[PDB]
């Protein structure tokens, strides 16, 4: 089956939102880690 060239808008949106997701995941991991360990300790 002949491959179809994806419209550039979709490709660019894909890779953009991909990078944005990497950034959001990293930043939320880092933002929640301290609160995470803090509540872990304060539970005891």
């Amino acid at each position: 089956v002949p491959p179809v060239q994806v419209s550039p808008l979709i490709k660019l949106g894909r890779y953009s939102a991909l990078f944005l997701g990497v950034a959001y995941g990293a930043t939320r991991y880092n933002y929640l880690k301290p609160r995470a360990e803090e509540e872990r300790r304060i539970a005891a």
Binding site: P3, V4, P8, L9, I10, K11, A17, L20, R28, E37
Partner: protein, 77 residues
């Protein structure tokens, strides 16, 4: 086996620096149909098609999210 990469080299590619103009033209077409409210001429089938490819890019965002936290299931912490 390898045809996966064969199709990737067409549709799974980091978009070239030479095609962003076409994308911004599509963007301004979309925002213009939004401003004029011309989307009402759009029959529901292609509107659904657009919404589904939109959820597609949204999933690209979420997979970027999970690869950005290095955790597959929720947040490890």
């Amino acid at each position: 086996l390898a045809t996966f990469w064969y199709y990737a080299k067409v549709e799974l590619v980091p978009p070239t620096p030479a095609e962003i103009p076409r994308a911004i033209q599509s963007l301004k077409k979309i925002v213009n149909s939004a401003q004029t409210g011309s989307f009402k001429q759009l029959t529901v089938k292609e509107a659904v098609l657009n919404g589904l490819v939109a959820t597609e890019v949204l999933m690209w965002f979420y997979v970027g999210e999970i690869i950005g936290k290095r955790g597959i299931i929720g947040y490890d912490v």
